[PDB]
RNA sequence: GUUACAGACUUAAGCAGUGGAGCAUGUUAUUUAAUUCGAUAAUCCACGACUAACCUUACCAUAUUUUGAAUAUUAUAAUAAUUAUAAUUAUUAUAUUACAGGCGUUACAUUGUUGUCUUUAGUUCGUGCUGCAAAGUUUUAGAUUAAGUUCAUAAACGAACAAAACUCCAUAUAUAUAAUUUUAAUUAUAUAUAAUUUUAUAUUAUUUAAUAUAAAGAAAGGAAUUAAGACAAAUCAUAAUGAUCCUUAUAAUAUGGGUAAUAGACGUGCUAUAAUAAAAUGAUAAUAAAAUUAUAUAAAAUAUAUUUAAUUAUAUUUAAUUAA
C-alpha cells in the first residue's frame, strides 16, 4: 500500500498512452502563437514596442532582396519575425530560405546580409535597433533547406518567385511538383507508432520505479529511475510535429489573361486531421483559440499586371 | 559534443542588472552612475566603437532623437571611441537621485506683493493665489526653471509674455 | 588571441581551416570597409590544398567575389522532393523550447550552487528601533511612472510619543490614520525620483512628530477621533466576523483514535 | 547522495567540481525532494548536463535569446549551410519508407504487387502506344468538370497485346499511366500465321464499326486504319490489308480489332483438330 | 550504473527546495505578469531555485487572479453588424515573496533573475526597508565614503579564474572610485 | 477498423459461456485462452461537526453541522432574520426533513456570493453532504430526494447579436 | 510612433556594399514608366 | 406554378411585446449653399458609425498653398558630429525634373473579409468492378441519428474536406502553492482524473431497441467552429491594387456653416396610459457578479441649493491605489 502511494506521488511521464504531462517537445508554447512575445506593466510602452517590432519586420523584408550588379536578383524569402522581449534583452528571430568547395573564398550576398545582422562590430543592424528599444537586440536567422517546412515562406515564395508558372494558368509540371512534394505518408500508422513508443517509455519508467521499490515519497537515485532513458533514445521520438502529412495551396485572383473574371484554383494533398489526438492522452490545442496547433495557415498577396492576387498555403504536420 | 565551459557568476557580472530603484545607499550611487553613463551615450545595450571601423562609426542618440518638432530626418552622427569619450555626470542630477534633495519653490511673501499693488486686501488675495499655485506646481512635474517661470506668471510677479518665447 | 582577424600578417603558420575561419571573420567584421591584403592572399593560397581549388582560381575568387565565381562556372530546386533531413517550423520551435529548458536546467545545476558563495545570514533590525517601513517599487524592464512612488507606513503606538501627543498626532493624520489597525501610512508621487519622494515623506513625518510634541497652547484633548473614512472603507469591504458557537461543540462525538495493530508492531523505534 | 571529491573528479570535469561541492554543502543529506506535478522544470530523460549537445542544446557561437556572449563576439560567419543538423542518424525517416521510363518501371512494380506479374518483362519487352487522348467533361452542380481520357495499346511484339483505358481529373499524364496499367492487366495472346499476319480474311462487327481485315503476302505491309496499324505494330502483325465501314470511332476500332484478332481468327491447327483433317500451307511446303 | 549523479542534478530533476522563514520580515515581493502560463511557471520555478541557494526564505508562486481584457468587433469590414466576434486577453499574475535577507543578497538575486529572464514574462518588485523614525543626511561626506567602501568590498574580484565580467560594471566601479565623484557633493 | 458490434457481441457470448463452466471442472487451457480477454473517507472534526461546502448559481455555502439540539445560524445571525422568504427556509430544512432529524442537528451555515434563494439552496446542498457523513446508509435516500445533486443551472451569457442570452432583437421580413 | 526609425534610404548609408532592392518603389517606377509609354503619364506641373 | 417524407421557434399552446400615444434613433422623401459617402427583400433601416459642438469630415461658402508626405537624379551653400586649422560623413537650406497626392469612377477588374443558404449535411478521391462510352458503383435495399450518424444489405475496399471528437467557459474530485495582514481558503491558478454515463429487473416488438422501475454517480448546460457551391449578395469610405480620369486642382491649409433641415411615410427602441402597482422611508447599512482606474479612479470631510439632518446635485480638496 505504501509502495502504491509512493508510485502515485511520483507518477508522471510524457502524455500519449491510451499521471502524465505534455512536455516541451510535445506541444507549442502559447507564447509562440503571438509574434511580439512581451508583457509590460505600462501598456502604452507595450504598444510602442509592438509598433516598433512591426516596423522592423517591414525593414527586414526590404533588406531580404539583394542585387548583383543588375545581373541577378536573388530574392531571399523570410518568415514573419518573432520578437522575444525578455526583461534584459529583445531577441528577433526568423526562418529564411535561399535558392564542390569553391565558395570558401568569397562572401555570398546572402552571407554578407546575415553578417550585417549581428557581426559588423559597430555598424551591425542589431546595434542600430537597440536605440529604438533601449535594450540589447539579437537577430537570429534560421535557414530552411526546403520551401514547404514553413507555411509563410512557402506562400511568400510562390507569390514572388514562381509568377510565370501560374499567371496565365497553373502549368502542368509545376502543379505535379506541388502535388508530389511529400511521399504520401500513412499518418495513421505514424501517430499509432508514436503512441506505442510513448506507452513503452511509460512502462519502462514504471518498471524502473518498481525495481527501486523492490511518510515520505522519495524513491531511489536518479540513475536507477531513468535506467534506459537517455538523449539518444527519448527526445526525437517524443518530438511531436515532424511530418508534413497534408497540405492545401490556393491561388486566387486575376490569374487568367484572356478572362476578365477571377480564378480560385486549389491544390489539395494528404489530410488535415491529426490521429495522435484521436486515440490517446495527448489533446489538441488551439492557437489564438481558433487554429488547431498542428495546422499553420498563411497568405501573401503580390500585385500582377492584371491586378491583385494572393496565395493561401496550409500545412498539417501530423 | 564538447565540455561545458563554466564561467563563474559574480556581483560584477550582475552589475547593470541591479534594480534602478532599490532602498540601499550603495545601490543608489551605482544607479546614478549607470544613469550618467546612459546619458553620456556609453555602449550599454550595444557593441562599442573602437579604432577598427573608421567611416561607419554611426549613432542615433543625437540631441532630439525620437522627437518630431525639430525638423529633420534620421541623423547618423559619428560616435567617439571608448577613448576620447566624456561623461556628463551633473551635480543637480546626483542631488536629485543619490540624496533626496528637492527645491519646493519659494513662498511669495506679502512685502513683494506690496511693492507692485497698493491696497491691502488685494495684496492678501494675490498672496493667497500664489500659495494655491505653489502646491499645485509642486505636485506637477515639468522642469526646474520652466516650473518656476510658470509659478511667477501665476503670481503676477512676471507677465504672460514671458511664457510665449 | 581574440583580436587575430584584424592582423592578416600573423597567420601563415596556422592550419588551413583555421586560416579560412579567420578570413571569414575578417570579411564579417569589416563588411563594407573590407580591403584586401597580400599576407592574407598568401595564406589563402597556402590553404588551397585543403579544399580542392587551383592556385590561379583561388586568387581570382579573392579578387572578384560572386562575379568571379559565376565566370568560373542553374535549375530551380525549390519544390525538390523531401529527403527527410530537416525539421519543419513547429518542430523547430519545439526543439528551441527544449534547448531553452536544457539551458535552464544546466544553469540550475552548475551556476546556482556557485551563486551560494555569495550568501549572508539575516541581520535583523529590531522593530523597537525600526518601526517605519518605506516601501519602494521598481518595474524591471519598463520605465513606469509609478517607480517614483514611495510609501511610508508606521504603527502609531510604535512611535516614541506620550499619550496626549499621540492623540494629537492621530488627529493631524486624519484619513491617513486607521484606528482598527493602529497604522498611519502615506505615499508621495509629487517628485521626479523615488529617493526624493522618500525624503519628502520623511520630512513630513518629522514635521508631524514635531507638531505632536508641541503642546504649547494647542493640546487637542477635546476633539474626538474622526473614524468616518475607516467605517466607509469597512462598508466597502466585506466582513466574516461571525464564528462557530463554542457551546455547540461536541468533543465526545468526535472520531476517536482507531487501534491499528500492525502499525503499533512496526513502531519499534 | 553525497559523493567524495575524488570520485566526482574521476567522472566530472574540473570546472563543475567546485559547484558540485557547493551544492553538497548547501543541500542537506536528509532531503525529501518532492515531485512537481503541475510544472516540469527538467527533461523527461536522465542527463548529466556537463556535455553540451550539438542539436539538443543551443549552438555556442550562434546568436539567440540566452546568448551569454558579448554583442561583438558571435562565432558564425557562414550562413550557406544549416547550423544545427539532426543528431545521431542523419535522417528522420518513418518505419517503411524510402528516399527518391521511370513511370513505366513504377507501373511494372505496382503490377507485380497487385497481380504477381514479372516487372522486368513489363519494363523492357512491352512497348506502349496511345491511340486516343480525349479531354472529357461532366456537367455537375459545381460546374463543368473536365477529365482526361486516354486509351493506350501496350504489346510485346510477339503476338502478346493489350488495350487499356484510364482517366484522371488531374492532368493527362496520370490518365495515360492508368491506361497503361489497364493495358498490362489485360495482356492477350493473339494468334497469327507465320508470326506476321492473321490466318483468314476476317469480317467482324464491334458495335458501330464494321471491320474487314484481309491477310497479306509477306512484304506487303500494314495497309489499314491508323488505329489498327498502331495495334498491329504492338501485337507483331507485319502484313495486313483492311478497311473500316460504318463507325470509325477510334476507341471502338481499337476495342473491335483486338476482339476480332482473339475471337474471329482460328489457327489452322485448331481447325484441323476440329475437323479431323490435314490442313497444309502450300507455300511453306514449296519453300517459296 | 557506477555513474555518480551529484545532488544539484537530482535537485534539478525534482521540485525546487524552499528554505524556512525565521521571522515574518517581508523584505521584497516580486509579481510576475504574462499573457500565458508555461513560460511564467518555469520562470517562477527558476526564481525559487536561485532563491534557495541564497539564505533567503522565498515563499512561492501564489497565483493572483488572472485579468480579462475583452473586446468585441463586427467581423466584416462594412456593415453586417449583426455578426460580431469577441476577443480576450488574460494577464496571468504570480507572486513571489522573499522573507529574510540582507539587502545585497536580495539585489543579487533580482539582478540574476533579470539577467536570465524569459520571453513572455514581465516583472515588478516591491522592496521594503525597515528604517528608524529619525534620520539625518547632514554627516554626509563620511557616509558617502563608507558607502563607496561597501561597494568596493561587494564588487571585488576574489580569484580571476575566467569568471563572468562586465565592461559597463567595471566602468561604473572606476567612476565610483574617482576623485571627481568624491568631490561632487561638497 | 474492420471489427463490427455484432462480432464483438458474439465474442463476448463465447467467452462468457466458457467462463461459466463450474470452476471445479474448468481446465488450464480454457483459462489460458480466457486470460487474454480480462481487464478518501470523510470524518468529523476535533469538535465533532461535519463541514461541507455547497454551491448554486454564484452562491457558496460552507456549513458546520453538529449533533446538538436543532437550532440554525445563517452567516452569523438568526435564520428568520437572514432568509425572509419562507420558501428558502423550507428548502434549507428539506435535507433534515427527508430524514427524521430536523431538531436533532445543530447547523451553523456560512454563505457568500449570489442572492438569497440561491444562497439558501447552496446551504441546503451543503447540509445534505454534511448529513451524509453522520450516517452513510441514508446517502442513497438523500440522493433520491434530490438534495445530493449539485444544481448545475448556470446563468447563460449574453451572446453578441442577441439582446440577452436567447432574446433576439426584432426581425423584419419586408 | 518613433519618427526616427530605420528606412530603406539608410535598409545605402550604413551598408554601401550590399546592393539592396526596395520592391514597392521599383514596382511604382515600373508603373510610371508604363504610363509614360502608353500616353497616360502625369501632365507637366504649372509653376507660375 | 412537382412527387414523398422528415426537420425548428416553422406552426400550435403559453409569456411578454410591436402595430394607437408622446419622445429617442435610423431610413425615406422633399428641402438646402451644403444637408458628405455608402448600406436599402429575406441576407438595409441604434447598419458601416464603441459617442458629428471645433476636430472627426469626406460635404458647402470665403480665403490661401503649388514638388507639395515620398523616392531618386543634378547642383550651389551652411551647420554639427568625428578625427589628427584641414578632411570624412551626416543633416538642413534654395532650386531641379520624373512625380507625389486623390473618401474621384468601377466589389459587373480585384484582394482580403463578411452576409444568406449553414452547425445545415452535404462535397469529393484512390484501387477494384459495371457500361462501346460520357458516366455509374463506392456516396444505399430497409431503418436509425441531431448528422454520407452508426446498423444492415449490397461490386466493392479504403481514404480526404465537412459531421462527431479533441478546444474554451462552467461543474465534481484529487494534488500542488498562498507563513490565512494583498485573504475571498466559503477563495485563486497550474496540473491531472471524470461520462458522447454505467449496471440490472420487467414490458412491447423483433440477439437487440424503446419505455417503465430500481442503484451507482456532482454529473445538467453554454461558447467557438457555420463545408462545397451559389446569390456578378455587401465593401474601391479599414486597407491595398488593376484600368481609367484630375494635376493652380477632383491634390493641400485655415475661418465659419452643414451632416441635427421637416409635409406625409417606414422600421428599430424608450417612456408611458395607477392598486395581482406606483411613490416616502429602512446606518450595528439584507443579499451579487463581472470589470475599470499613469492620456487616471477620486474616498472621506466642509460649503451652497435646503433650518435642523438625510437624501439628490454641484462646488471646495485630494486620503488611498496605479491594485487579489
Ligand atoms: Mg471497358
Ligand atoms: Mg406563435
Ligand atoms: Mg404609425
Ligand atoms: Mg408606435
Ligand atoms: Mg445617408
Ligand atoms: Mg453599391
Ligand atoms: Mg439593429
Ligand atoms: Mg474645419
Ligand atoms: Mg476631398
Ligand atoms: Mg496615381
Ligand atoms: Mg471579394
Ligand atoms: Mg447523396
Ligand atoms: Mg455518384
Ligand atoms: Mg480568510
Ligand atoms: Mg465540430
Ligand atoms: Mg459555403
Ligand atoms: Mg459582388
Ligand atoms: Mg453587385
Ligand atoms: Mg481602384
Ligand atoms: Mg464609392
Ligand atoms: Mg484608400
Ligand atoms: Mg482641394
Ligand atoms: Mg444621421
Ligand atoms: Mg403606476
Ligand atoms: Mg441596502
Ligand atoms: Mg464622498
From Swiss-Prot, chain A:
Lineage: Eukaryota, Fungi, Dikarya, Ascomycota, Saccharomycotina
Compartment(s) where it occurs, according to its Swiss-Prot or TrEMBL record: Mitochondrion
Protein name: Small ribosomal subunit protein uS3m
Functional description taken from the UniProt entry: Component of the mitochondrial ribosome (mitoribosome), a dedicated translation machinery responsible for the synthesis of mitochondrial genome-encoded proteins, including at least some of the essential transmembrane subunits of the mitochondrial respiratory chain. The mitoribosomes are attached to the mitochondrial inner membrane and translation products are cotranslationally integrated into the membrane. uS3m is essential for mitochondrial protein synthesis and required for the maturation of small ribosomal subunits.
Predominant location category: mitochondrion
Keywords: Mitochondrion, Ribonucleoprotein, Ribosomal protein
GO molecular function terms attached to this record: structural constituent of ribosome
Family assignment from sequence similarity: Belongs to the universal ribosomal protein uS3 family.
Highest taxon of the lineage: Eukaryota
InterPro entries documented for this protein: Ribosomal_uS3m_fun
Pfam family, one: VAR1
Listed GO CC annotations: mitochondrial inner membrane; mitochondrial ribosome; mitochondrial small ribosomal subunit; mitochondrion
GO biological process: mitochondrial translation
Keyword Ribonucleoprotein: yes
UniProt key word Cell membrane: no
Curated annotation (Swiss-Prot), chain B:
One GO biological process term: mitochondrial translational initiation
Residues of the full protein shown: 197 to 361 of 361
Protein's organism: Saccharomyces cerevisiae (strain ATCC 204508 / S288c) (Baker's yeast)
Assembly notes: Component of the mitochondrial small ribosomal subunit (mt-SSU). Mature yeast 74S mitochondrial ribosomes consist of a small (37S) and a large (54S) subunit. The 37S small subunit contains a 15S ribosomal RNA (15S mt-rRNA) and 34 different proteins. The 54S large subunit contains a 21S rRNA (21S mt-rRNA) and 46 different proteins.
Protein's cellular compartments: Mitochondrion
Protein name in the entry: Small ribosomal subunit protein mS46
Family label: Belongs to the mitochondrion-specific ribosomal protein mS46 family.
Coiled coil: none
Function: Component of the mitochondrial ribosome (mitoribosome), a dedicated translation machinery responsible for the synthesis of mitochondrial genome-encoded proteins, including at least some of the essential transmembrane subunits of the mitochondrial respiratory chain. The mitoribosomes are attached to the mitochondrial inner membrane and translation products are cotranslationally integrated into the membrane.
Gene Ontology molecular function, alphabetical: structural constituent of ribosome
GO cellular component terms attached to this protein's record: mitochondrial inner membrane; mitochondrial small ribosomal subunit; mitochondrion
Keyword line: Mitochondrion, Ribonucleoprotein, Ribosomal protein, Transit peptide
Main location: mitochondrion
Gene name as annotated: RSM28
DNA damage among keywords: no
Swiss-Prot record, chain C:
Gene Ontology CC, one term: mitochondrial inner membrane
Pfam families linked: MRP-S28
GO biological process, one term: mitochondrial translation
Gene Ontology molecular function, alphabetical: structural constituent of ribosome
InterPro entries noted in UniProt: Ribosomal_mS35, Ribosomal_mS35_mit, Ribosomal_mS35_mt
Keywords, sorted A to Z: Mitochondrion, Ribonucleoprotein, Ribosomal protein, Transit peptide
Signal sequence segment: none
Principal place of residence: mitochondrion
Entry annotated with the keyword Iron: no
Subcellular location per the Swiss-Prot or TrEMBL entry: Mitochondrion
Taxonomic superkingdom: Eukaryota
Extra remark: Present with 3150 molecules/cell in log phase SD medium.
Family per similarity comment: Belongs to the mitochondrion-specific ribosomal protein mS35 family.
Role summary: Component of the mitochondrial ribosome (mitoribosome), a dedicated translation machinery responsible for the synthesis of mitochondrial genome-encoded proteins, including at least some of the essential transmembrane subunits of the mitochondrial respiratory chain. The mitoribosomes are attached to the mitochondrial inner membrane and translation products are cotranslationally integrated into the membrane.
Record text on subunit structure and interactions: Component of the mitochondrial small ribosomal subunit (mt-SSU). Mature yeast 74S mitochondrial ribosomes consist of a small (37S) and a large (54S) subunit. The 37S small subunit contains a 15S ribosomal RNA (15S mt-rRNA) and 34 different proteins. The 54S large subunit contains a 21S rRNA (21S mt-rRNA) and 46 different proteins.
Name of this protein: Small ribosomal subunit protein mS35
Taxonomic source organism: Saccharomyces cerevisiae (strain ATCC 204508 / S288c) (Baker's yeast)
UniProtKB/Swiss-Prot annotation, chain E:
Chief location of this protein within or outside the cell: mitochondrion
One Gene Ontology term from the biological process aspect of the record: mitochondrial translation
InterPro entries, A to Z: Ribosomal_uS10 (IPR001848), Ribosomal_uS10_dom (IPR027486), Ribosomal_uS10_dom_sf (IPR036838)
Subcellular location(s) per record: Mitochondrion
Record's keyword annotation contains Ribosomal protein: yes
Keyword Cell wall biogenesis/degradation: no
GO cellular component terms, A-Z: mitochondrial inner membrane; mitochondrial small ribosomal subunit; mitochondrion; small ribosomal subunit
Keywords of this entry: Mitochondrion, Phosphoprotein, Ribonucleoprotein, Ribosomal protein, Transit peptide
GO molecular function: structural constituent of ribosome
Subunit note: Component of the mitochondrial small ribosomal subunit (mt-SSU). Mature yeast 74S mitochondrial ribosomes consist of a small (37S) and a large (54S) subunit. The 37S small subunit contains a 15S ribosomal RNA (15S mt-rRNA) and 34 different proteins. The 54S large subunit contains a 21S rRNA (21S mt-rRNA) and 46 different proteins.
Similarity annotation: Belongs to the universal ribosomal protein uS10 family.
Protein function: Component of the mitochondrial ribosome (mitoribosome), a dedicated translation machinery responsible for the synthesis of mitochondrial genome-encoded proteins, including at least some of the essential transmembrane subunits of the mitochondrial respiratory chain. The mitoribosomes are attached to the mitochondrial inner membrane and translation products are cotranslationally integrated into the membrane.
Annotated NCBIfam families: rpsJ_bact
Full protein name: Small ribosomal subunit protein uS10m
Amino acid at each position: 500500500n505504501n509502495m502504491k502511494r509512493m508510485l502515485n506521488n511520483n507518477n508522471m511521464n510524457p502524455a500519449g498512452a491510451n499521471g502524465n504531462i505534455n512536455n516541451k517537445l510535445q506541444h507549442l508554447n502559447n507564447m509562440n502563437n503571438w509574434n511580439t512575445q512581451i508583457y509590460n506593466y505600462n501598456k502604452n510602452m507595450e504598444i510602442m514596442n509592438t509598433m516598433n517590432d512591426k516596423l522592423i519586420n517591414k525593414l527586414l523584408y526590404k533588406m531580404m532582396t539583394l542585387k548583383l550588379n543588375n545581373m541577378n536578383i536573388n530574392k531571399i524569402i523570410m518568415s514573419k519575425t518573432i520578437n522575444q522581449h525578455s526583461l534584459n534583452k529583445l531577441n528577433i528571430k526568423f526562418y529564411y530560405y535561399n535558392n564542390n568547395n569553391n565558395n570558401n573564398y568569397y562572401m555570398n550576398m546572402m552571407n554578407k546580409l546575415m553578417n550585417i545582422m549581428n557581426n559588423n562590430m559597430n555598424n551591425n543592424l542589431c546595434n542600430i535597433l537597440s536605440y529604438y528599444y533601449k535594450k540589447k537586440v539579437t537577430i537570429e536567422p534560421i535557414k530552411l533547406s526546403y520551401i514547404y517546412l514553413n507555411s509563410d515562406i512557402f506562400s511568400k515564395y510562390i507569390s514572388l518567385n514562381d509568377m510565370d508558372k501560374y499567371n496565365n494558368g497553373i502549368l502542368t509540371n509545376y502543379q505535379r511538383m506541388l502535388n508530389n512534394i511529400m511521399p504520401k505518408l500513412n499518418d495513421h500508422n505514424i501517430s499509432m507508432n508514436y503512441i506505442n513508443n510513448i506507452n513503452n517509455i511509460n512502462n519502462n519508467k514504471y518498471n524502473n520505479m518498481i525495481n527501486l521499490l523492490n511518510n515520505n515519497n522519495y524513491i531511489g537515485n536518479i540513475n536507477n529511475i531513468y535506467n534506459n532513458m537517455t538523449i539518444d533514445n527519448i527526445p526525437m521520438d517524443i518530438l511531436m510535429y515532424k511530418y508534413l502529412v497534408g497540405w492545401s495551396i490556393k491561388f486566387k485572383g486575376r490569374l487568367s489573361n484572356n478572362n476578365g473574371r477571377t480564378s480560385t484554383t486549389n491544390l489539395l494533398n494528404g489530410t488535415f486531421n491529426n490521429k495522435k489526438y484521436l486515440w490517446s492522452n495527448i489533446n489538441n490545442n488551439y492557437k489564438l483559440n481558433y487554429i488547431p496547433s498542428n495546422h499553420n495557415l498563411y497568405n501573401n498577396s503580390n500585385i500582377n499586371k492584371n491586378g491583385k492576387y494572393n496565395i493561401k498555403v496550409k500545412l498539417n504536420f501530423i | 559534443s564538447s565540455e561545458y565551459v563554466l564561467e563563474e557568476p559574480t556581483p560584477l557580472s550582475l552589475l547593470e542588472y541591479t534594480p534602478q530603484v532599490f532602498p540601499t545607499k550603495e545601490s543608489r550611487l551605482v544607479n546614478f552612475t549607470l544613469d550618467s553613463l546612459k546619458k553620456s551615450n556609453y555602449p550599454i545595450y550595444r557593441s562599442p566603437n573602437l579604432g577598427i571601423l573608421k567611416v561607419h562609426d554611426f549613432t542615433l542618440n543625437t540631441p532630439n532623437f525620437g522627437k518630431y518638432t525639430p525638423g529633420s530626418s534620421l541623423i547618423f552622427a559619428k560616435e567617439p571611441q571608448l577613448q576620447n569619450l566624456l561623461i556628463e555626470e551633473d551635480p543637480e542630477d546626483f542631488h536629485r537621485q543619490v540624496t533626496g534633495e528637492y527645491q519646493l519653490l519659494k513662498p511669495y511673501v506679502k512685502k513683494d506683493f506690496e511693492k507692485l499693488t497698493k491696497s491691502k486686501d488685494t495684496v492678501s488675495k494675490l498672496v493667497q493665489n500664489s500659495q494655491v499655485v505653489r502646491l499645485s506646481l509642486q505636485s506637477v512635474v515639468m522642469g526646474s526653471e520652466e516650473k518656476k517661470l510658470v509659478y511667477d506668471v501665476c503670481s503676477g510677479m512676471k507677465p504672460i509674455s514671458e511664457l510665449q518665447q | 588571441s581574440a583580436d587575430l582577424y584584424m592582423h592578416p600578417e600573423k597567420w601563415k603558420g596556422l592550419p588551413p581551416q583555421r586560416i579560412l575561419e579567420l578570413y571569414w571573420e575578417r570579411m564579417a567584421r569589416l563588411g563594407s570597409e573590407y580591403k584586401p591584403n597580400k599576407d592574407e592572399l598568401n595564406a589563402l593560397l597556402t590553404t588551397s590544398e585543403y579544399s580542392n581549388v587551383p592556385v590561379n582560381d583561388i586568387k581570382k575568387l579573392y579578387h572578384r567575389g560572386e562575379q568571379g565565381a559565376i565566370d568560373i562556372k542553374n535549375r530551380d530546386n525549390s519544390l525538390r522532393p523531401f529527403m527527410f533531413d530537416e525539421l519543419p517550423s513547429q518542430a523547430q520551435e519545439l526543439v528551441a523550447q527544449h534547448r531553452e529548458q536544457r539551458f535552464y536546467n544546466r544553469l540550475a545545476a552548475y551556476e546556482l550552487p556557485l551563486l551560494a558563495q555569495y550568501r549572508q545570514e539575516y541581520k535583523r533590525p529590531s522593530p523597537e528601533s525600526h518601526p517605519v517601513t518605506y516601501r519602494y517599487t521598481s518595474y524591471v524592464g519598463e520605465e513606469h511612472p509609478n517607480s517614483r512612488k514611495v510609501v511610508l507606513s508606521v504603527k502609531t503606538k510604535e512611535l516614541g510619543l506620550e499619550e496626549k501627543s499621540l492623540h494629537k498626532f492621530r488627529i493631524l493624520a486624519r484619513s491617513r490614520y486607521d484606528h482598527t489597525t493602529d497604522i498611519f501610512k502615506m505615499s508621495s508621487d509629487k517628485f521626479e525620483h523615488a529617493s526624493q519622494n522618500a525624503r519628502y515623506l520623511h520630512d513630513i513625518l518629522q514635521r508631524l512628530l514635531a507638531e505632536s510634541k508641541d503642546l504649547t497652547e494647542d493640546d487637542f484633548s477635546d476633539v474626538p477621533l474622526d473614524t468616518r473614512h475607516t467605517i466607509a472603507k469597512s462598508l466597502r469591504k466585506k466582513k466574516r466576523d461571525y464564528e462557530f458557537p463554542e457551546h455547540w461543540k461536541r468533543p465526545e462525538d468526535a472520531p476517536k483514535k482507531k487501534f491499528d495493530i500492525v502499525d503499533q508492531l512496526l513502531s519499534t523505534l | 547522495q553525497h559523493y567524495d571529491e575524488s570520485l566526482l573528479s574521476r567522472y566530472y570535469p574540473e570546472s563543475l567540481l567546485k559547484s558540485i561541492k557547493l551544492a553538497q554543502q548547501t543541500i542537506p543529506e536528509d532531503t525529501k525532494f518532492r515531485v512537481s506535478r503541475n510544472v516540469e522544470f527538467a527533461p523527461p530523460y536522465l542527463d548529466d548536463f556537463t556535455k553540451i549537445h550539438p542539436f539538443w542544446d543551443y549552438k555556442p557561437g550562434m546568436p539567440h535569446l540566452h546568448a551569454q556572449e558579448e554583442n561583438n563576439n558571435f562565432s558564425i560567419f557562414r550562413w550557406d549551410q544549416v547550423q544545427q543538423p539532426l543528431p545521431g542518424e542523419g535522417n528522420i525517416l518513418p518505419p517503411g519508407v524510402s528516399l527518391p521510363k521511370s513511370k513505366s518501371a513504377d507501373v511494372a512494380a505496382g503490377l507485380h504487387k497487385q497481380t504477381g506479374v514479372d516487372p522486368d518483362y513489363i519494363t523492357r519487352k512491352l512497348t506502349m502506344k496511345p491511340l486516343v487522348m480525349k479531354r472529357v467533361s461532366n456537367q455537375t452542380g459545381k460546374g463543368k468538370i473536365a477529365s482526361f481520357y486516354a486509351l493506350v495499346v501496350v504489346g510485346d511484339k510477339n503476338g502478346m497485346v493489350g488495350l487499356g483505358e484510364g482517366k484522371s481529373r488531374e492532368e493527362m499524364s496520370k490518365a495515360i499511366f492508368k491506361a497503361h496499367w489497364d493495358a498490362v492487366r489485360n495482356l492477350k495472346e493473339i494468334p497469327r500465321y507465320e508470326n506476321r499476319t492473321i490466318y483468314g480474311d476476317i469480317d467482324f462487327r464491334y458495335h458501330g464499326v464494321k471491320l474487314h481485315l484481309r491477310s497479306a503476302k509477306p512484304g506487303f505491309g500494314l495497309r489499314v486504319n491508323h488505329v489498327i496499324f498502331e495495334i498491329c505494330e504492338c501485337a507483331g502483325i507485319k502484313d495486313l490489308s483492311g478497311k473500316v465501314y460504318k463507325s470509325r470511332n477510334d476507341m471502338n476500332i481499337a476495342k473491335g480489332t483486338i476482339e476480332a484478332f482473339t475471337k474471329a481468327q482460328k489457327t489452322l491447327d485448331e481447325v484441323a483438330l476440329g475437323r479431323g483433317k490435314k490442313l497444309v500451307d502450300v507455300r511453306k511446303v514449296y519453300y517459296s | 550504473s557506477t555513474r555518480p549523479y551529484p545532488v544539484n542534478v537530482e535537485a534539478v530533476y525534482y521540485a525546487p527546495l524552499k528554505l524556512p522563514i525565521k521571522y515574518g520580515d517581508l523584505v521584497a515581493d516580486i509579481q510576475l505578469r504574462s499573457y500565458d502560463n508555461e513560460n511564467l511557471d518555469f520562470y517562477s520555478d527558476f526564481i525559487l531555485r536561485t532563491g534557495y541557494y541564497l539564505g533567503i526564505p522565498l515563499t512561492g508562486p501564489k497565483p493572483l487572479p488572472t485579468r480579462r481584457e475583452r473586446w468585441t468587433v463586427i467581423k466584416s469590414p462594412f456593415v453586417h453588424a449583426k455578426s460580431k466576434e469577441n476577443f480576450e486577453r488574460h494577464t496571468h499574475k504570480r507572486l513571489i515573496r522573499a522573507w529574510d535577507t540582507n539587502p545585497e543578497v536580495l539585489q543579487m538575486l533580482i539582478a540574476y533573475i533579470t539577467k536570465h529572464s524569459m520571453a513572455g514574462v514581465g516583472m515588478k518588485c516591491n522592496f521594503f526597508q525597515r528604517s528608524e523614525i529619525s534620520l539625518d543626511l547632514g554627516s554626509d561626506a563620511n557616509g558617502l565614503e563608507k558607502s563607496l567602501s561597501n561597494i568596493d568590498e561587494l564588487y571585488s574580484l576574489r580569484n580571476d579564474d575566467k569568471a563572468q565580467t562586465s565592461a559597463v560594471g567595471q566602468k561604473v566601479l572606476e567612476l565610483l572610485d574617482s576623485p571627481d565623484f568624491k568631490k561632487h557633493l561638497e | 477498423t474492420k471489427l463490427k458490434p455484432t462480432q464483438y457481441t458474439q465474442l463476448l457470448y463465447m467467452l462468457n459461456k466458457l467462463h461459466n463452466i463450474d470452476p471445479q471442472l474448468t481446465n488450464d487451457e480454457i483459462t489460458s485462452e480466457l486470460s487474454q480477454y480480462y481487464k478518501k473517507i470523510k470524518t468529523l472534526d476535533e469538535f465533532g461537526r461535519s463541514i461541507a461546502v455547497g454551491k448554486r448559481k454564484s452562491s457558496t455555502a460552507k456549513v458546520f453541522v453538529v449533533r446538538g439540539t436543532g437550532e440554525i445560524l445563517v452567516n452569523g445571525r438568526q435564520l428568520n432574520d437572514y432568509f425572509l422568504k419562507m420558501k428558502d427556509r423550507e428548502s434549507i430544512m428539506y435535507p433534515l426533513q427527508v430524514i427524521e432529524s430536523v431538531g436533532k442537528y445543530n447547523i451553523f451555515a456560512t454563505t457568500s456570493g449570489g442572492g438569497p434563494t440561491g444562497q439558501a439552496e447552496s446551504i441546503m446542498h451543503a447540509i445534505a453532504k454534511a448529513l451524509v457523513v453522520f450516517n452513510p446508509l441514508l446517502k442513497s435516500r438523500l440522493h433520491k430526494a434530490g438534495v445530493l445533486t449539485r444544481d448545475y443551472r448556470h446563468v447563460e451569457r449574453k451572446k453578441p447579436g442577441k439582446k440577452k442570452a436567447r432574446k433576439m432583437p426584432t426581425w423584419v421580413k419586408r | 510612433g518613433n519618427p526616427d526609425i530605420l528606412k530603406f534610404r539608410h535598409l545605402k548609408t550604413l551598408y554601401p556594399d550590399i546592393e539592396f532592392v526596395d520592391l514597392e518603389e521599383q514596382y511604382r517606377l515600373s508603373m510610371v514608366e508604363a504610363k509614360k509609354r502608353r500616353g497616360k503619364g502625369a501632365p507637366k506641373k504649372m509653376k507660375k
